[PDB]
Design a protein around this ligand. Structure first.
Ligand SMILES: Nc1ncnc2c1ncn2[C@@H]1O[C@H](COP(=O)(O)OP(=O)(O)OP(=O)(O)O)[C@@H](O)[C@H]1O
Ligand SMILES: Nc1ncnc2c1ncn2[C@@H]1O[C@H](COP(=O)(O)OP(=O)(O)OP(=O)(O)O)[C@@H](O)[C@H]1O
Ligand SMILES: Nc1ncnc2c1ncn2[C@@H]1O[C@H](COP(=O)(O)OP(=O)(O)OP(=O)(O)O)[C@@H](O)[C@H]1O
Ligand SMILES: Nc1ncnc2c1ncn2[C@@H]1O[C@H](COP(=O)(O)OP(=O)(O)OP(=O)(O)O)[C@@H](O)[C@H]1O
Ligand SMILES: Nc1ncnc2c1ncn2[C@@H]1O[C@H](COP(=O)(O)OP(=O)(O)OP(=O)(O)O)[C@@H](O)[C@H]1O
Lengths: 16, 535, 415, 125
């Protein structure tokens, strides 16, 4: 079984 | 105020070979905006706000986009260079997309109908817009981007002062909802030019040199246009550029210190030899068959050692003319058959070369060594699909018995390839287009057993050398043995019948030549005797 | 200001065996930047903006790129080491690409046609520029990067002050749209050298030693050039390095505390014995040949027990002469047949050894135990592909019936 | 709508009685299938020597009827397909045909659809 490929990511910003 | 700059001329934009496409675009897009308004209001139609361009690399799409942008009298166009909208945060890509249409909406709301035009250019549009629901990862942003674009182009609010231009290399990957009328109507294909287009393009890129007297008088443009086949605009420009540098290099010395003459630089001129040299060592097209193929397939040329050689060519010419002229039979086929080592591939290549058709291709097994069965079928289907696109085409299939793996033991062979070939030999191309197929083999009875010899229209036989006179004529035409030795050779062969193939004689002669000068004819005769005969 | 450095000199570069390739590169790339500007203006041509170099390992691509970088009087070149621009956040891998062209665009906008030159180098370009899938459902893992690069090299906005250089070992995987005459126009192959190039390389790498009288008088470089057949540029340097190390090792003693005798270290010299030892044990080429295989296949030598042994060898000599001195027949083949245990695989090995061709390879079933037919076909194709990069090649196919998996029952074999 | 021009590329000419006889038989079969309730399914086979024009006559017979749904299944589209893809395609075509109240389907070049070769012989079961 071929291991799952790499993935991107999504980011969320927070305000102080 | 008109929508075209007063100082605009079609010959100023430097595009050649696309008169029809430009005419169609102008008719479909800008016809409404130039015609007097009152009739348009009476007629009550809406303008068009979408253009798509597709085609193979290096044909002139970006040039068209830039020139169209320069033609119109309006605001400076907005250009997007590929996927420049994507952002790492959430909801920023959609904001970036929405920021493009702000000014258009503001002007529409303020000035209503009496408003200017806004142009937006998307380069590599297939990067951001793809069919929804196909990406396994990171699809959260792509689908949202597509939906935002669709809603903005055509939504509840209506705009009537925007024009969108897109360029792509893969038209079939774009979402269908974006291609319906009302969003992107005018779809255009830009393809390779014909001879007239090549001549126009070549004339465009040599105007300055002629104007300034830097071009020699022995250069003929028409010869170049005729010679340069399958080229595209970029390749023609590259050829001219290489020719220009080959001339500049004759006045520089890069031995130890780079030095220029500057006293012979004046009187610099470009000659025909520069063009010829640049065409054989610098630039090579990336389409179709070229000289490097005929060189390999026809290695030792063709020599008229007898009558049948002319007979075969005169029989092939009749079929070439028939396929060119007739209209009731758009598809024709022929089979060349003969004993081994007779020279069938060379004759087929010669006939195809003299056909002079725009499209020529050769399908041989030596380019598919080690392939499976499906790979072979797929590689054949691709070659046959590209001839349907052209107008009149010719194709060659050599060594059929090797294309399908036949071995006398068993027997054993590939059924899939046989069925694919039997299907393709009776498939006709689209209306108005014509195709010729030539095939070569060395085992007629086997093909007859499989019921393939009745899918061909006619057959041509390629015989062997049969008499000593023909052998002596071939020897004379090759000029390998002198008259004194040829007399001795004739003393032996004239009273006998011979049975030899042309491709074997050239090997026998080479084998004989290695011996010492005294034992050459003797060795040649011994080998010939050993060969025997079996008519 | 001239584009070329005032003090540049060809002999200073230190590259040997590539005089034609460099001439072609110079002519096609820098010819239009040395000529007077007014005449070039009159002709109305644009400059070339691309170079690609491909070939087998160790033949001097990264050296040529670095020297080209150092020979121009311009800014400091930008370098990208393989996939150094990949990132995990969405939309960053493409910002990295767009960040390489900022200075060029700014200078083009400001200074117009009086700008300098900006160079960019892509090492292992095939890692980030593979062909786009172009079929729905197998979209490439990175296609946005390819699209961004294509849009930036040649787009709606025109640049005339850039130059890009790429390097690869697998030129057949690059995207086609990247290699058209408008983007990467000049493509060159760097291959193995010939005898003259080997002499030039050896002189380049021995000049400094010869300067300080550190090289013995019994060393002849022409003989070394003759002996070293089918050696790449790196292997000659490795040979010289090994010889120097062997020479140095004689004045050190390491089986207890490490001491160096600095009284005979001032009479240090390199002899040909070191070179001979190095050629036998340390450096083993890849496209050449070595004597171990012959010892493996001719185990017990060849004895002349009769007349046929001479006839078989004389026929092979004749065939070798024909194949080397012929033009109409560039390919010739022969078959050796006989009863079992007659010793036919040693005679073939002996003929191949006596041919004296630069490239000699033996294909045997001993290295294909348990393989399926596909693997065997792939191995044969690899050997024959390697054989087409030499001016004279000889190949031997051994035990054909064990290669086809023939068995009398049935019969059964691999088609 | 099928591209009947491709299959009928040179029209039809009445060079003899058999043409009219075949067309009349086809019309009779169409009428029977249209106006029957005991036999909802009907089948017929056209056979003859090679180069007789069977495909054109079958296409004409199909066209002359005015059924809402008409389709033609040919091996021209199934090039390089496996023995499963063909089954799936035929199943899809018949499933689509089932929806309409009246359906007519044409299967041409049966022997090419089974991959028949007289050596051994061979075919797909
Ligand atoms: N029809 C043409 N007439 C004149 N010049 C042309 C033509 N086609 C191409 N050229 C020349 O080739 C150059 C490159 O063409 P262009 O960039 O417009 O191609 P493209 O189709 O957008 O390419 P790609 O598919 O690689 O993105 C143009 O700048 C122009 O110099
Ligand atoms: N009149 C001629 N006709 C054909 N070939 C010729 C003629 N004169 C010289 N030749 C040379 O003879 C060779 C023809 O061999 P070719 O490979 O075409 O033969 P073939 O019968 O197709 O091959 P094979 O039997 O090995 O499958 C080519 O080198 C061709 O240049
Ligand atoms: N033509 C040459 N002349 C002189 N030295 C050379 C030459 N080719 C290689 N060398 C020597 O070998 C060293 C290593 O070779 P280089 O890094 O240029 O090879 P390469 O082809 O880029 O390698 P790879 O394909 O493995 O990435 C050079 O720094 C130099 O010392
Ligand atoms: N004159 C000679 N000719 C050939 N081989 C010789 C001669 N004198 C000695 N020998 C030795 O005889 C052996 C020949 O064995 P080899 O494996 O080459 O034979 P073979 O017939 O190919 O074998 P097989 O039938 O088992 O495949 C080698 O060890 C070789 O060195
Ligand atoms: N009276 C006719 N009957 C049938 N076909 C005719 C007639 N007159 C002309 N034709 C034309 O004859 C051509 C031959 O028909 P078609 O290709 O269908 O034959 P076929 O018997 O199915 O062929 P094959 O034996 O190759 O499978 C068709 O273009 C058809 O238009």
């Amino acid at each position: 079984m071929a291991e799952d490929a790499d993935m991107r990511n999504e980011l969320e910003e927070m305000q102080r | 105020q008109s929508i075209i700059n007063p100082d605009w001329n079609f010959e100023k934009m430097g595009i050649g070979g696309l008169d029809k496409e430009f005419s169609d675009i102008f008719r479909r897009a800008f016809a409404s905006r130039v015609f007097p308004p009152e009739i348009v209001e009476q007629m009550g139609c809406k303008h068009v706000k979408g253009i798509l361009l597709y085609g193979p690399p290096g044909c002139g799409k970006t040039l068209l986009a830039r020139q169209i942008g320069k033609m119109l009298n309006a605001r400076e166009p907005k250009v997007v260079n590929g996927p420049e909208i994507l952002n790492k945060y959430v909801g920023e890509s959609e904001a970036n997309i929405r920021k493009l249409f702000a000014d258009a909406e503001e002007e529409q709301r303020r000035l209503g109908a009496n408003s200017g035009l806004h142009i937006i250019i998307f380069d590599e549009i297939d990067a951001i817009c793809k069919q929804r629901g196909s990406m396994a990862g990171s699809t959260g942003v792509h689908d949202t981007v597509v939906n935002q674009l669709l809603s903005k182009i055509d939504g509840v609010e209506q705009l009537n002062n925007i024009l969108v231009i897109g360029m792509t290399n893969r038209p079939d990957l774009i979402d269908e909802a974006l291609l319906r009328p009302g969003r992107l109507e005018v779809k255009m294909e830009i393809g390779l030019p014909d001879e007239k287009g090549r001549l126009q393009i070549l004339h465009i890129h040599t105007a300055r040199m002629r104007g300034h007297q830097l071009l020699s008088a022995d250069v003929d443009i028409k010869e170049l246009a005729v010679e340069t086949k399958n080229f595209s605009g970029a390749e023609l420009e590259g050829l001219v550029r290489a020719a220009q540098s080959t001339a500049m290099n004759r006045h520089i010395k890069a031995s130890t210190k780079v030095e220029v003459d500057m006293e012979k630089a004046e009187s610099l001129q470009v000659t025909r030899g520069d063009f010829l040299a640049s065409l054989e060592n610098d630039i090579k097209p990336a389409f179709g068959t070229n000289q490097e193929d005929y060189a390999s397939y026809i290695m030792n040329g063709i020599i008229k050692w007898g009558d049948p050689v002319t007979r075969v060519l005169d029989d092939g010419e009749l079929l070439v003319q028939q396929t060119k002229n007739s209209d009731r039979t758009p598809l024709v086929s022929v089979l060349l058959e003969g004993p081994p080592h007779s020279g069938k591939t060379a004759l087929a290549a010669k006939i195809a070369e003299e056909s002079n058709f725009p499209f020529i291709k050769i399908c041989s097994p030596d380019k598919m060594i080690g392939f499976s069965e499906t790979a072979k079928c797929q590689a054949m289907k691709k070659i046959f699909d590209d001839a349907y696109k052209s107008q009149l085409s010719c194709v060659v299939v050599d060594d059929i018995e090797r294309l399908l793996d036949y071995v006398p033991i068993g027997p054993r062979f590939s059924n899939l390839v046989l069925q694919a070939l039997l299907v393709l030999l009776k498939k006709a191309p689209p209306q108005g287009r014509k195709l010729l197929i030539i095939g070569t083999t060395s085992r007629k009875d086997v093909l007859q057993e499989m019921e393939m010899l009745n899918a061909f229209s006619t057959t041509i036989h390629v015989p062997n050398i049969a008499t000593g006179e023909q052998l002596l004529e071939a020897l004379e035409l090759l000029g390998n043995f002198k008259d004194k030795e040829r007399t001795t050779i004739a003393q032996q062969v004239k009273g006998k019948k011979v049975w030899i193939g042309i491709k074997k004689l050239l090997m026998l002669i080479e084998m004989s030549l290695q011996m010492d000068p005294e034992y050459r004819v003797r060795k040649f005769l011994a080998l010939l005797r050993e060969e025997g005969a079996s008519p």
